[PDB]
Structure formats: structure tokens, C-alpha cells
Amino acid sequence: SQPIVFYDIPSNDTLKQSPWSPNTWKIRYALNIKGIKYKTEWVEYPDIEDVVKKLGGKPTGKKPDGRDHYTVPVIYDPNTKTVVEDGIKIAKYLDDAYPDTPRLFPAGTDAFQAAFDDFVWSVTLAFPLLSLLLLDVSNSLPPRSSAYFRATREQQFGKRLEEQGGEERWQQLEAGLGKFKGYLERNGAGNDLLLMGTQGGITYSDVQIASLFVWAKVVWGEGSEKWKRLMGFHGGKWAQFCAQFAEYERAD
Amino acid sequence: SQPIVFYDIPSNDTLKQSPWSPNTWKIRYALNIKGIKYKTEWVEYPDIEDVVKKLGGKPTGKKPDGRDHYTVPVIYDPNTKTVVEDGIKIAKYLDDAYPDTPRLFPAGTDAFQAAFDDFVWSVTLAFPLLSLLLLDVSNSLPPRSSAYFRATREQQFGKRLEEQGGEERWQQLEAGLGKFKGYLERNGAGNDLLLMGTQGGITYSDVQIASLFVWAKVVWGEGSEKWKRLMGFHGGKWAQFCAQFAEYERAD
């Protein structure tokens, strides 16, 4: 059985070309947790539209110009001759097409995890963290990608990148992560480190959060002041949380 | 074994004193689905804080004045001499203390359902519908409660009640309800009428939506233009959704 081709966006020498994207990382984690064979195909931001089209992939949405929006993660599975785009579809595909690998969407959790998906990618939690990372990401891309990144994101938010971030958002972040700590604590003590209990296994929804963190960790650097601050939060719960995902970090 | 005392806010003769609140209804449903014996204690909006204090209950949050905020639903269980406040705590309590009754929080769904809670009570879905009901609710209350309701809610949003609502919100409502339809549809055909599939049973999270709808139905009236419009949405999916809850409507 052949390796799955996995399209990821690369980084420059300041990150040792470690993968960084919180969106592709949720599928890298999927692959690693599931132990399915894959090889990374690196693609630059400006080249994603053409690469995914030439590949026969579908766009994951529309831009405000009504123009097709093509994104990564994306996968080509030789073993089934299919091309899956859109991270939460790709993860379920890895469930359906490889049923003897750990299930990221346990039975009946399918709609709950979809709801949780809107919680993550929202002004509550991912966007604050984005703002803290928008600039450092620009400086962590190869030149062509970095240029595309700065242009498009600056347009997207009306600000320069250097205007983004600051303490207003470090609070919003702590607040969102707090809300999440809240939800987890409803699982009761001893179960407050995975959405379905530190008993009933890792889910895609867990992986989504793990991915926000690994993204921060890679771009700021395990030693940075920013990373250590974030691990500061909530008595270091997120340190304990991220540890569960340590064995699943295989940059390739 | 003795009836649970269940505090709900009453309505005037225009609703035949049917209970109406979408917050108390989710616990009414819980009790009816679980077939646990209860009797309703009616309490007026302005008398809630004192009733719950004289009862030994805790407030469920803070007002912006930092002043304690006491709310219903609330229950007193004679059989265990305890007083639970806060809807989602009350529902879990009815799980824990009555384990041979249908479980509203199936194992490991605890945090997922807590995340869903924030989905429901948000500008996405519950608030748009609130704006469509704020006025008719005020006209549906006993005079003392109606007065308190109009006062406090007008202060809360900075508009008169009569300024609230309109098409802008009927769209937001259709949109949020669409987003729900989307989540459900991830369960696959034949499973898209309950969060855990029309197979794996009714959850508290399901009940929360059913309660928004019964609220609308009671206040507007099963015959109203508004109610029929709402049932119009998404090809009448919500009609099908609501039917699952019909046998659990016991005003008392």
C-alpha cells in the first residue's frame, strides 16, 4: 500500500523548514495518530491554486470576490485514486477509508464535532491567536510565500501586519482558552484533557486545538517568551494538554 | 418517592397560562422525557431573586453591575434534599441522581454538549429568535412580570421592545438554523434529526433546540403567521425535528 501525498506549506531556514500551519497540522496529526504512510509535497502559498487545480482538487469555499478559494491541507490517496480537500473532510475520509486506524470521529460525535469546529475558528479563540502570529508567520515563510502572505492578509484585515496583535488579544485568547477549559471540566476531574474524556480517546476536535498550539510552538519557538507565556495560561493545563500529542509530531 | 419542585415563570390568559420560557422548557422536557414526577411552582420575574434566595439556591452568574444574577429554571429535589440551579447542571443532575431514566448526557458527550451550548445561545441562533419574540413575550406575561421584563430587557439592549426584530433577524435566524441543519447532515441521511443520529437517542443538546421552538410555538401560537413561517424554513425540516418532541409536552 502506497504513501498518501500530503500537501503542506513550507517554512524558511529560521524554522528549519518545519511544517507550521495550524490547518495542515491537523491532518499531519491525523496521519501520525493513525499511522498511515504519507509523504509531504511542499507547495508555496501563491502556487496553491494551480497545484490543486492541476491535481483535480475542489476549492473549499469562495473569496469575497466570489472567486474560487483553493486551500490546503489537501491529499491524494493513490490507494483509492481520490483527492480530498478540506481538513474536516480529509480527517473523516481517513476514518472511512482506513477503518482499523484509530477513529477520529467516534459514532454519533459527527455533528457535535462540526459544531465544535465553528467554536475553534472564531473570534473567540483561533482569531485572537492568529493576530498574535500573523507577523511572525510572514517572517517564517520562503520569500515568495511571505510576499503573498503579507499582501493577502493585510488586505484581508485592513491593517498592516505590524498593527496586529497586542494585549487586547492575549486577553481574548486566554478567555477563549478558558471557555475550552470550561467545557473540558464538564467531563469531570481526571477526564478534563480530552473532549471525550482522557478515557474515551483522541478526536479530531481535540486535534484541532493541539494544532493551534503546535503552530504557536513552531513559529514562536519552544524557547520563546510568547510560547512560555501561553503555556503559562490556566496553571499550565495546556502544557498537560499538548503533552498528549507529543509522540505525534513527525515533520516530513 | 416525592415530586420534584420545579420553578417556572407564568403567562397570562392570552397563552392560557401555558409555560413558555425556552430556558425552563428544556428542563420540563427533561423531566417529561425521563418520566420523573414533578409539580410546577410558578414564580413572577421580579420575585425570582427572593424565591431562589429564601430557597437556598445559588445565582447562575453576575449582572454587569457585578450584582448577583439569580435565574430560573431551578429545582428542589425532596428525595435528595438538594437545590439545583442552572439548566445544563439541572439536566446532568437529573442524569446522575436518576440513572434508570434516559441519559441526556451519553458517555463522553459531556464536553461536546457544553460546546454546543455556546452555539445555541449566541448571536448565531438564539438571539435572532429572541429579537423576534421580545415584544410578544412582554405581552404574554402577568402584569407585574411583564413590567419587569420590559424594563430590564429594554435597558439590556438599549432599544424599546417595539424597535426589536424585523427581517434582518429572520435572515440571521434562518442562517443559524441552516448551520444546525448542516451539522445534523454530517450524521448522514436517516440520522439528520438528532445530534447523535435518529438512532442513538435524544440528548440535552437536542432538547435545547426543541425548547427554542416550543417557546416560539407557545408565544406566537401554533396557528400564527410567524410560527408557520418558521416551520416553513428548510423545507419543513424543523417540523420533522419538532415532532420528535411532541409526546413530551406536558404543561403543569
Residue numbers in the entry:
A (entry chain A), B (entry chain B): 2 to 253
Show sentences the authors wrote.
Glutathione transferases (GSTs; EC 2.5.1.18) constitute a large superfamily of multifunctional enzymes that are involved in phase II of xenobiotic detoxification by catalyzing the conjugation of glutathione (GSH) to a variety of electrophilic compounds. Most of the GSTs are dimeric proteins, each monomer harbouring two domains : a thioredoxin N-terminal domain containing the conserved GSH binding site (G site) and a more variable C-terminal α-helical domain (H site) usually involved in the binding of the GSH acceptor compound. The fungal specific class GSTFuA is particularly concerned by this expansion. As assumed in our recent report PcGSTFuA2, PcGSTFuA3 and PcGSTFuA1 share the same structure, which contains distinctive features when compared with canonical GST structure: (i) a new mode of dimerization, (ii) an original β-hairpin (β2’β2’’) that inhibits the formation of the regular GST dimer and acts as a lid over the G-site and (iii) a supplementary helix (α4’), between helices α4 and α5, that closes the presumed H-site.
PcGSTFuA2 crystallized in the space group C2221 with three dimers in the asymmetric unit. The observed holo conformations can be explained by the presence of crystallization agent molecules in the G sites, which mimic some of the interactions formed by bound GSH. In the structure of PcGSTFuA2, a citrate molecule mimics the binding of GSH glycyl moiety. The distance plot, which compares superposed structures of holo PcGSTFuA1 and PcGSTFuA2, reveals no big differences. The largest is localized in the center of the helix α4 where a residue is inserted in PcGSTFuA2 sequence. This difference results in a disruption in the continuity of helix α4.
